[PDB]
Amino acid sequence: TSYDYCRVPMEDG
Amino acid sequence: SASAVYVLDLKGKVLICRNYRGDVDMSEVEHFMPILMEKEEEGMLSPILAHGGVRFMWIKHNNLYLVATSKKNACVSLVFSFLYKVVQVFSEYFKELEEESIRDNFVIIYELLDELMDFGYPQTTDSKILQEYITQEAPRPPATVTNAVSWRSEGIKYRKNEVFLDVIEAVNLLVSANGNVLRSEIVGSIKMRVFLSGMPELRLGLNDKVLFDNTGRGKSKSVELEDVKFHQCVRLSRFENDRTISFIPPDGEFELMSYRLNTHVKPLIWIESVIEKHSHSRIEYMVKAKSQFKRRSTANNVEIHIPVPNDADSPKFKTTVGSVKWVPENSEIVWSVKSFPGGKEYLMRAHFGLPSVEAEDKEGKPPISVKFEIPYFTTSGIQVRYLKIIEKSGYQALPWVRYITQNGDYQLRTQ
Amino acid sequence: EMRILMVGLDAAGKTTILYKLKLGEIVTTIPTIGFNVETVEYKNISFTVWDVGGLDKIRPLWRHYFQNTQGLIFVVDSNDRERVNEAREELMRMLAEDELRDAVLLVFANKQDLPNAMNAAEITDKLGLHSLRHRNWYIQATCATSGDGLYEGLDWLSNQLRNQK
Amino acid sequence: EIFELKAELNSDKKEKKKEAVKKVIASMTVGKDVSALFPDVVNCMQTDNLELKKLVYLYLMNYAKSQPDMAIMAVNTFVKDCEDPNPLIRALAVRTMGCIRVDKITEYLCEPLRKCLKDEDPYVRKTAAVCV
Numbered sequence A: 001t002s003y004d005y006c007r008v009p010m011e012d013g
Numbered sequence B: 001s002a003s004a005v006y007v008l009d010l011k012g013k014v015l016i017c018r019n020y021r022g023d024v025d026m027s028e029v030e031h032f033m034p035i036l037m038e039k040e041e042e043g044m045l046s047p048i049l050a051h052g053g054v055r056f057m058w059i060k061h062n063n064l065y066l067v068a069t070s071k072k073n074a075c076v077s078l079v080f081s082f083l084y085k086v087v088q089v090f091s092e093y094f095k096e097l098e099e100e101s102i103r104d105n106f107v108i109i110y111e112l113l114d115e116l117m118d119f120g121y122p123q124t125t126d127s128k129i130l131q132e133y134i135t136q137e138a139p140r141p142p143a144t145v146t147n148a149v150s151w152r153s154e155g156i157k158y159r160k161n162e163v164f165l166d167v168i169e170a171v172n173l174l175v176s177a178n179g180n181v182l183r184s185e186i187v188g189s190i191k192m193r194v195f196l197s198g199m200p201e202l203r204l205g206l207n208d209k210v211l212f213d214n215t216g217r218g219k220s221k222s223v224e225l226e227d228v229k230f231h232q233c234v235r236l237s238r239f240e241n242d243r244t245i246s247f248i249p250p251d252g253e254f255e256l257m258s259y260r261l262n263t264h265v266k267p268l269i270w271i272e273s274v275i276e277k278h279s280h281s282r283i284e285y286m287v288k289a290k291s292q293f294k295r296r297s298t299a300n301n302v303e304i305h306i307p308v309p310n311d312a313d314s315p316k317f318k319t320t321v322g323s324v325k326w327v328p329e330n331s332e333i334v335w336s337v338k339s340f341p342g343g344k345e346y347l348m349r350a351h352f353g354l355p356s357v358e359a360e361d362k363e364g365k366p367p368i369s370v371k372f373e374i375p376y377f378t379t380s381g382i383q384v385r386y387l388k389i390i391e392k393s394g395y396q397a398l399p400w401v402r403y404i405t406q407n408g409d410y411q412l413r414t415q
Numbered sequence C: 001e002m003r004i005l006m007v008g009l010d011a012a013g014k015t016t017i018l019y020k021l022k023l024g025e026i027v028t029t030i031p032t033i034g035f036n037v038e039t040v041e042y043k044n045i046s047f048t049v050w051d052v053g054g055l056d057k058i059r060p061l062w063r064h065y066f067q068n069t070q071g072l073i074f075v076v077d078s079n080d081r082e083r084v085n086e087a088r089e090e091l092m093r094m095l096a097e098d099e100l101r102d103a104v105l106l107v108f109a110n111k112q113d114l115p116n117a118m119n120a121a122e123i124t125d126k127l128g129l130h131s132l133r134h135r136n137w138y139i140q141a142t143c144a145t146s147g148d149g150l151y152e153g154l155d156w157l158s159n160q161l162r163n164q165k
Numbered sequence D: 001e002i003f004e005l006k007a008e009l010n011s012d013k014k015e016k017k018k019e020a021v022k023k024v025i026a027s028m029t030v031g032k033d034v035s036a037l038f039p040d041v042v043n044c045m046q047t048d049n050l051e052l053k054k055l056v057y058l059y060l061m062n063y064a065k066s067q068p069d070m071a072i073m074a075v076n077t078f079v080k081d082c083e084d085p086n087p088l089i090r091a092l093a094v095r096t097m098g099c100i101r102v103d104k105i106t107e108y109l110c111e112p113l114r115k116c117l118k119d120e121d122p123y124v125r126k127t128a129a130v131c132v
């Protein structure tokens, strides 16, 4: 997979 | 309720056969291929053939006809889902599925058809767990094959803790030749690649419309998931109560949810094609491709397949941007554009000859069908919001996501 | 590296002494409808033992081992006089063959805990072991619940397998 | 040919009878009447291997309608392998017991099936339930 990711948050309660 | 899972090939010889009940004779498979050739040479083809009182459910893979006979009032949805799960189990052991894998792995394929199905009732088909007591390289079967969490062997340990998502869209489209849009639906598929340590309990949270309406936020950007089909791993009762997606993930690649929503907004790539087909002389294609989507995102490698006549010859291609190859194996001009920015409009003009003596049979009119792929760009507007890692051990995992739009069957009917 | 059988009429305690030689216990065993095969490593010659039961539907199924067959043990049932006659007829059916020719005979006097049991001489005179040409036979008194006399019969058997020091 | 196959199948070393039974169920794969070699592969059944018992059980599963009177030389081995502490070999024995459609055999096989329907490890119970 040539593309790149983006971090998503963990808690968001 | 299958009776005898076969594996045929493209001639009618049995690569491997394995009967489960003995309620269908083993020499009934020799009656398959003449019945399929008879039913196909009169256009009455169906997946359910009939040799007297024995029904031939079958799917057709690359070289393989995975025929599975039955005799009673067989549960056909069960049989066909089992056949595609046999295809998926074989393709997760043997990275392609051809005749060159069935005649080499009879050590393990008879063990697999021994394991997957008993008496016609499929019972253990998750391949990542099935790789732990049926190997091509035996211990006790795992407690995963017993317990309710039947897709995740306990005690998996990684040094890092990464959760890779893929919210892959797939725009469908079917534009009729008058110029209006008939069926413009979007089939997303959040396809994870999990690497975690232990028995976690994720809680994926989308921007689902029913969740934003039960919360009270029904005026912001919310995707309207018309139907959502989850994996097994998602507990569906908790999803049905208050739209919470909680699941214990497998280890490896799988398809978490497969949503499907309609869209009454414009198509992404629009193909205004004309045809100057003079009879017996020539044909011309003043096809233009206007990119309706946003100015920021770049449609990587679009391939606007455009159906030429079957017997055209000696072409000419005046484009603006992007190469044209004429592919005569398929009778289409695969107009490739590598970087296709949103808002532009690239024009192409093919030009063929045509044979002066006319054809013998009519040909039909296949659709223009593009192959676009727009990364970092979700058409429906789904936004993953969080992914709560919950583990008794307790650690900080690293979730990730990326966004892709592709084609589904992005067809456009022609003149 | 020599193989050996255990045939005869059923309820003779033959799988009893089989797992006595194999493990060393008095095993609880159903009447052996099929067969049994394990091996015994003792005196550096592997005693691979092939029990076949004695039910009437499996009496004709003894010939299917008699290809590449090197030994023989007949296990008597001396506590049934009304069945030792048909056991003798079964034995004379089995020793009327041209395919079992190198296999020596080895009679085991089995279930030696009842006072009605005979010695190692009356059973021989009743079964007619002296009238067996080209047969190297030897009777042996073996008690199943104790396990005595088993390895001495196996020692005679190992004297029959190899003919060296 | 098949006689030398039987000669390898009446050996004392495991790595010739193992290739023998793999060659037998490769001959069964390509569509050969190897039905005449039935009571000689069943001597090579009671093995310490488990990757080999699956193949012999498979051969028993295909060739018991055609050798029905011969098939009574596996019942003691089924009730012998339905005591083993490994649950996989018990469930393999149980799903082999039902597939043999011989009317001289299923009368004998209700006792270990009765033993296994109440057995502990729930892999063999979920096999024995369908074996009923």
Ligand SMILES: Nc1nc2c(ncn2[C@@H]2O[C@H](COP(=O)(O)OP(=O)(O)OP(=O)(O)O)[C@@H](O)[C@H]2O)c(=O)[nH]1
Pocket (backbone or CB within 6 Å): C009, C010, C011, C012, C013, C014, C015, C016, C017, C028, C029, C030, C031, C032, C033, C052, C053, C054, C055, C111, C112, C113, C143, C144, C145, C146
């Ligand atoms: N009292 C007493 N009974 C014995 C002795 N040895 C064997 N038996 C009896 O002999 C019977 C036969 O036991 P098995 O060995 O399991 O049966 P088998 O002799 O192999 O006969 P089949 O297996 O049916 O062909 C058992 O039920 C025992 O009760 C013994 O030393 N003393």
Ligand SMILES: [Mg+2]
Pocket (backbone or CB within 6 Å): C014, C015, C016, C029, C030, C031, C032, C051, C053
């Ligand atoms: Mg016995």
